[PDB]
Design a binder for this molecule. Sequence first.
Ligand code: HEM
Ligand SMILES: [Cl-]
Length: 214
Amino acid sequence: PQDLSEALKEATKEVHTQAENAEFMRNFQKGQVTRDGFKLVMASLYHIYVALEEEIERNKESPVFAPVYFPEELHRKAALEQDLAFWYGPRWQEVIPYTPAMQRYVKRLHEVGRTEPELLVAHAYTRYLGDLSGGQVLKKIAQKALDLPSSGEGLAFFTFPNIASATKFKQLYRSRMNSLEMTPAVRQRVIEEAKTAFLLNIQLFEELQELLTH
Ligand code: HEM
Ligand SMILES: [Cl-]
């Protein structure tokens, strides 16, 4: 479509559906998810966000990203750090897994943020808006499947405290995206990257399923 936020949504509808149907993901939604499986996803999210957020902090000033820089409303590293301390304990940083699929997603994120930051938005959109959209559902699922204690910890990731209305925020984010100024050449690179980001998630899910079935 015309608006970037639309072109993105439409250009990734296919890969997005593949993501949904990925065995691991498909099972998660079907309510079937183990703690180890859940821990693997959380550990993955931590790594991905740590990388993504580092790159965002590096290019926040650039015009290629500034318009969609919403640190307070979206940052997840800290939330994830709280959750992993709960899921893996006080030395989670020294025990959480860091698999190849994860490693590869991180690598691309740093590649983008270092050499082609104009593509960073493709990842911020993919991750933030995706997690913001599916967050409420997935939470209740793992909340019902895992049956965690009353510790009052472990799921901070599913709550963006600095965002009152997900809907209104998404509207604002999309708008800032469409306001993002880029040449058509770049716009196409951003679209591709978004498909890449999905693929990366897909590879990731597939690898986790593989690890779990063993
Ligand atoms: C349990 C699996 C999943 C289901 C069933 C699912 C379902 C949905 C639905 C129904 C929406 C809301 C559409 C809207 O608000 O217009 C959405 C949006 C989104 N999802 Fe997923 N999703 C899942 C997994 C993923 C994954 C793995 C990614 C990629 C990491 C992803 C990224 C996104 C993005 C970027 C959006 C926003 C698209 C836009 O701008 O309109 N989703 N998803
Ligand atoms: Cl809402």
